Amino acid sequence: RADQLADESLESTRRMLQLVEESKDAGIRTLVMLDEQGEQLDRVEEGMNHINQDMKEAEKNLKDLGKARENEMDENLEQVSGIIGNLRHMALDMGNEIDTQNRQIDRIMEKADSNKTRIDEANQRATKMLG
Amino acid sequence: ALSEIETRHSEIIKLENSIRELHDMFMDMAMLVESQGEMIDRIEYNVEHAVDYVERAVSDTKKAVK
Amino acid sequence: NRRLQQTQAQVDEVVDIMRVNVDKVLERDQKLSELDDRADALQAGASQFETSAAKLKRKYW
Amino acid sequence: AEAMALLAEAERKVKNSQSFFSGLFGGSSKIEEACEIYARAANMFKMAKNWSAAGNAFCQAAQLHLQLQSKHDAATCFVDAGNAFKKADPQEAINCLMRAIEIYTDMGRFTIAAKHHISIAEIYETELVDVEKAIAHYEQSADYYKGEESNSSANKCLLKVAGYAAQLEQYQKAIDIYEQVGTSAMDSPLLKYSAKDYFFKAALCHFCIDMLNAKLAVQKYEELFPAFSDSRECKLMKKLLEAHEEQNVDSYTESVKEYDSISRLDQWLTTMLLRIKKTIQGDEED
Amino acid sequence: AEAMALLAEAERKVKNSQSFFSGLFGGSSKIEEACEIYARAANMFKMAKNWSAAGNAFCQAAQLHLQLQSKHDAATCFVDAGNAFKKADPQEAINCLMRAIEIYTDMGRFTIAAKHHISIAEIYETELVDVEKAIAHYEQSADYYKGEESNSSANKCLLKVAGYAAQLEQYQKAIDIYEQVGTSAMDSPLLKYSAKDYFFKAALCHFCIDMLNAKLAVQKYEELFPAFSDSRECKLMKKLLEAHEEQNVDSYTESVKEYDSISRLDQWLTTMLLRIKKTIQGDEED
Amino acid sequence: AEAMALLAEAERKVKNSQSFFSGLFGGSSKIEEACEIYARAANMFKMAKNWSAAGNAFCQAAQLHLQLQSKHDAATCFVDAGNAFKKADPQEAINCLMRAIEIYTDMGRFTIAAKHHISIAEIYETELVDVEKAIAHYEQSADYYKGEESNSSANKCLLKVAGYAAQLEQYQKAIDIYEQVGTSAMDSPLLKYSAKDYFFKAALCHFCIDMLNAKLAVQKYEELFPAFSDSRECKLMKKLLEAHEEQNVDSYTESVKEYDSISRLDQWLTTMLLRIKKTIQGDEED
Amino acid sequence: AEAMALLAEAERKVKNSQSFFSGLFGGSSKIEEACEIYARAANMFKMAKNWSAAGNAFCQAAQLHLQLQSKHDAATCFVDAGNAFKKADPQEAINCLMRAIEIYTDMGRFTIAAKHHISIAEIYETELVDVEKAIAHYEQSADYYKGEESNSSANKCLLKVAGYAAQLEQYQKAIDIYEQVGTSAMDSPLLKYSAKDYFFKAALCHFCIDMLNAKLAVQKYEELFPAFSDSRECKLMKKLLEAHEEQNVDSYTESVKEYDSISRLDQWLTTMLLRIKKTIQGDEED
């Protein structure tokens, strides 16, 4: 048991790597997207802004027209440590991407709604002058 | 010295333990973020396109007054 | 030796980092989930405006 | 701006005009005016946290919107009604949502239809406790997701389907669902990661087979010992298969106690593991 | 370019025209122009780093927008004003936001109302140090979030509420909140691991009870000796409960010293721990 | 409400009006009516799971939409049809997509064009099993991504290109791609750790070179000893470079067996490693 | 069909109408028509990877788009041009972007202005190698982000500013930035982990100080050795502060060698550590 633990747990330290390494792989796909999506939402936000503009004009037109075993076991830890730093790297990129976009969602939701109203009002004045 | 060798193991496992679970989270993570990634691919679609629907409307309205 | 009994918290601390990382992302899911029902539903009304604006074109233009 | 007053005037205008009122033109807008009224009512109803009334109010503005020809913004109202009743104290949360999907479906909006479809199957289970219909919804919903290229979500629902399917005796149908969701997961080497647990669940689900359906399912599983994710799936399974093939309700009951260390056993696993723990003793005493 | 010129033209145009200027129609088209002017001014006042000027400018454009009937975009302007005063030097940061919410709320927009509602309680606490009003906001806001079924968000706010509730001596009312946020966070396996801290906080918060409660809550908690995370929750608590029931201000302040290694104590914990450490002495020398 | 009926009415209205029925103004509105018809049909064909019919229906509404002068919303239909045919039983899946790209591409929409371009190269591989055509698409698509300063997606495609390029036979053309994707990866500290595997792949790929292209590619790599990430890259490579430069096919196969311990190997690696195993055996008995 | 033909038609129409041809309304419909033409051309140019032609074409359409009276859509067109030129053959990548920000900034759109502002400073460094002009942008942009309360982004920029400020000998101006970005990081328990590296950088940056500018900054740093994250921060620092106060260019140069084990040094650290390494040598025998 004594050795079945100083080695088995040692295998866990070795595994402790792929465990925190597979996490990076899982983090990459996330970050890679969070970044890709970040730029996407930029062109997406343009939509809420593009519509925000046109609607103003559209409304006006509708208004104008409407009217050594332990030595290694100690090293593996250092390995985990070096990787722990990485976990911080992603934790920040993921964090700064989350907070920057959440607030972006706010602006999107705002303008999107603001324009929704203009569409409804215009749709109630246009539907009548149909055909 | 035995005592230190046994106490060592005790702390090592308690460590090994906390580890395995943290790994469990990323697994579920990659399954969540991805499930959300597809929920945005349609957004970008419905957005830049809505810009076309609105653009076509604002254009027709202008050429309906001049 | 001591590194073992020590490094133990070097991860228990990260176990907390992800605990928030898993939550942060999930919080965005709901923010984007609702935005998915108000943004898509938004253009939905735009479709009504596209049809209305198209007809006002075949009568006054 | 009295609530019940708005509810009254809204009724005063929600009706085909006639006499001098009808005048020259109809009132396709009257009905819309009424919708806006009831909405204004449900607003203050949601204010005083009287939700119930708010929901019943939205049901009115929504139903009226249909009598105007505007399925879109109408269905959205049905959603508002559902969210109200849901968070509210009465029921109706099920009716509004059904009346919402029929619209998102007929119109041509399956993305969102499935979005509310999962909410539905989720309520019909955690509330009404009607799994026989919940599964039906979780499934049809996953089908819609699987047609929107939306793979993940589709699987999200499938997991629910099989998950609650095995908790209803449908053990075999469950392993089959796990096989499908397992095959439609390898195509994405970005899912390789979760494709394990599926094999674990599927190997655990037993329709009382006498062959080695599990010893075979664990074999089909490509695993490498040095692997880590994998050690959290088949490794345990093998030991459980041996403890079953040897009618030993001790090695199994102790292996499930050990694995519970490296990997915490959720509710599901627990329930099923106990079902197998009884199949062993039952086979000992058969 | 010249804000001092734009503001001037701005007022010179925002006025119900008459005589030959009014003609037949006049109002909306003009007042809106002024709104755009003041926005244009407030912007350069923002780059100029005046802030105060920018804020009051947005207040002008905002107030004006209302005189045109457009509560929506108006309220969003008030948000700009709030953002200005916030990262500025004068006050009004709180007023703008109140003027924003009074609009979003009555408009039936609770989803965004809560968005700025939490921002509000956040300023009213971190700055105004007005905790009594801040809690009122964090709470009502959480109710809105809970209405949208935005669980996580609602919990964020609740955590704020309870967290600042224990600081204001309201210990019991805090543990209750931790109980609620604890019962509505178990069904989701993505919050399991987290439900710990809740039980830890709730067990720490003492309404000066002289018995269980904490010894009972620690029991209600589901833990396993092989648990990893649980080691960062009740395992410590037990030892603390024993050092309290024995009025030993030497075993409590010691165990907290050890725990400050495996899981460092945040400001909160420290504050309350020291409070409990004093209650012990206040029971010894009595 | 019958699809078969709608498909008929649509036809009756989709046709350049002739005789008196035409007059002066064309049928720009009629063609649109037909599009709406077929759309409604494709819709009920999708709830019925008749997919085939759904897809062909969308193809009709789409083609007609083109006959109306609206490439945008047309192409959109082409995509819907592709999503239908894909999760269906007939073909056309490849045709609809090409017909969609020709539109997004000539319309000024490369972002989305590449989005479907990769989908295409993905289907032409996981279905048609046409690697050479798929590579061509993964490549031309990565050019667009890299143009939309979406380096990230660009590389996502390049990896595909090189990856399957080494499987076909193009070992050299593979390393070149790994070199490019490797140089354009260091400019982003968020890919440093991943930049290893690239060098591992590029060093493994051999176009039957006699020099030391690999012994040079491994040297170009910057590694030390107290690094653990790098341990899963070149450290092994050197051992393989020595096992190749000594025609010892048991030390190569033994080291692959050892490395398959600290970092478990995947299908790709396996296939290539065996290819290198055979080059060695083939140099021994010669 | 061909772009060369479109550019020609576009040119023959992009001419302000006068006399009779102008009539009552010359209209901006002509200039806009040409804009659509050039956009259509620039795109197919982006197809043949002609880039140069694509970019210059977009510049044309955008330039005309200004003569149209619609600064917004034009601005984003300039962005399209920048996207072409950037990953192209010629330059102008810097011009288009400047021509874009001059529009977003004056238009009152800082939110997006900063978005492209950072892209700008990101190119003016990794390409033009004009650090003095890059920092100015990273900074002004961070001011905008900080204006939009977007703490996160603001810090992303500040890190760049200080990061490259120390490279340009600006050490004190660097430490100040690290101190600010460090204080405005503790208020957020979601940055605690990162707050280390900040203190390490700031304690490393030395404006030729000989005192305890760093020996005091290391103290301000709340640490407890068995924390690790912190070990990758002040530990080494302390050992560096002793090696400098004793003009020992051997204890410092050895410490950098040992520390480069547990935590590799990036190019930044390498360059600075070498500068500090020289501050010792030139000081010993002086």
Swiss-Prot record, chain B:
Compartment(s) of residence: Cytoplasmic vesicle, Secretory vesicle, Synaptic vesicle membrane; Cell membrane; Synapse, Synaptosome
Cross-link Glycyl lysine isopeptide (Lys-Gly) (interchain with G-Cter in SUMO), sequence positions: K62, K63, K66
Post-translational modification: Phosphorylated by CK2. (Microbial infection) Targeted and hydrolyzed by C.botulinum neurotoxin type C (BoNT/C), which hydrolyzes the 253-Lys-|-Ala-254 bond. Cleavage inhibits neurotransmitter release.
Record domain t-SNARE coiled-coil homology: where: 2-64
Positions of the record's site feature: (Microbial infection) Cleavage: K63, A64
Expression tissues: Expressed predominantly in cerebral cortex, hippocampus, cerebellum, adrenal medulla and retina with weak expression detected in non-neuronal tissues.
Domain of life: Eukaryota
Subunit structure and binding partners: Part of the SNARE core complex containing SNAP25, VAMP2 and STX1A; this complex constitutes the basic catalytic machinery of the complex neurotransmitter release apparatus. The SNARE complex interacts with CPLX1. Interacts with STXBP1. The interaction with STXBP1 promotes assembly of the SNARE complex. Interacts (via C-terminus) with KCNB1 (via C-terminus); the interaction increases in a calcium-dependent manner and induces a pore-independent enhancement of exocytosis in neuroendocrine cells, chromaffin cells, pancreatic beta cells and from the soma of dorsal root ganglia (DRG) neurons.
Family according to the record: Belongs to the syntaxin family.
Protein name (record): Syntaxin-1A
Native source organism of the sequence: Rattus norvegicus (Rat)
Residues of the full protein shown: 191 to 256 of 288
UniProtKB/Swiss-Prot annotation, chain C:
GO cellular component entries: clathrin-coated vesicle; cytoplasm; cytoplasmic vesicle; cytoplasmic vesicle membrane; glutamatergic synapse; membrane; neuron projection terminus; perinuclear region of cytoplasm
Places the protein is found: Cytoplasmic vesicle, Secretory vesicle, Synaptic vesicle membrane; Cell membrane
Site residues by UniProt ((Microbial infection) Cleavage): Q30, K31, L32, R38, A39, Q48, F49, A53, A54
Keyword presence, Iron: no
Cytoplasmic compartment segments: 1-61
GO annotation terms (biological process): calcium-ion regulated exocytosis; cellular response to insulin stimulus; eosinophil degranulation; establishment of localization in cell; exocytic insertion of neurotransmitter receptor to postsynaptic membrane; Golgi to plasma membrane protein transport; hormone secretion; long-term synaptic potentiation
Tissues expressed in: Nervous system specific. A higher level expression is seen in the brain as compared to the spinal cord. Expressed in hippocampal neurons.
Keywords tagged on the record: Acetylation, Cell membrane, Coiled coil, Cytoplasmic vesicle, Membrane, Phosphoprotein, Synapse, Transmembrane, Transmembrane helix
Predominant subcellular localization, coarse grouping: membrane
GO molecular function, one term: lipid binding
Ranges where the v-SNARE coiled-coil homology domain occurs: 3-61
Disulfide bridge map: none
Domain of life: Eukaryota
Record's bilayer topology term: Single-pass type IV membrane protein
Post-translational modifications reported in the UniProt record: Phosphorylated by PRKCZ in vitro and this phosphorylation is increased in the presence of WDFY2. (Microbial infection) Targeted and hydrolyzed by C.botulinum neurotoxin type B (BoNT/B, botB) which hydrolyzes the 76-Gln-|-Phe-77 bond and inhibits neurotransmitter release.
Family designation: Belongs to the synaptobrevin family.
Protein name as it appears in the record: Vesicle-associated membrane protein 2
Organism of derivation: Rattus norvegicus
UniProtKB/Swiss-Prot annotation, chains D, E, F, G:
UniProt keyword annotations, A-Z: Acetylation, Cell membrane, ER-Golgi transport, Membrane, Phosphoprotein, Protein transport, Transport
GO biological process: apical protein localization; brain development; intracellular protein transport; membrane fusion; neuron differentiation; positive regulation of ATP-dependent activity; protein-containing complex disassembly; regulation of synaptic vesicle priming
GO CC annotations on file: glutamatergic synapse; neuromuscular junction; postsynapse; presynapse; presynaptic active zone membrane; synaptobrevin 2-SNAP-25-syntaxin-1a complex; terminal bouton
Domain of life: Eukaryota
Modified residues (Phosphoserine): S19, S22, S188
A Pfam family per the record: SNAP
CDD domains associated with the record: SNAP
Subunit and partners: Interacts with PRKCABP, and disrupts the interaction between GRIA2 and PRKCABP, leading to the internalization of GRIA2. Found in a complex with VAMP8. Component of a SNARE-like complex that contains at least ZW10, USE1L, RINT1, STX18 and NAPA/SNAP-alpha. Interacts with VTI1A. Interacts with STX12. Interacts with GNA12 (via N-terminus); the interaction promotes CDH5 localization to plasma membrane.
Entry's family note: Belongs to the SNAP family.
Function (record text): Required for vesicular transport between the endoplasmic reticulum and the Golgi apparatus. Together with GNA12 promotes CDH5 localization to plasma membrane.
Protein name: Alpha-soluble NSF attachment protein
Source organism per UniProt: Rattus norvegicus
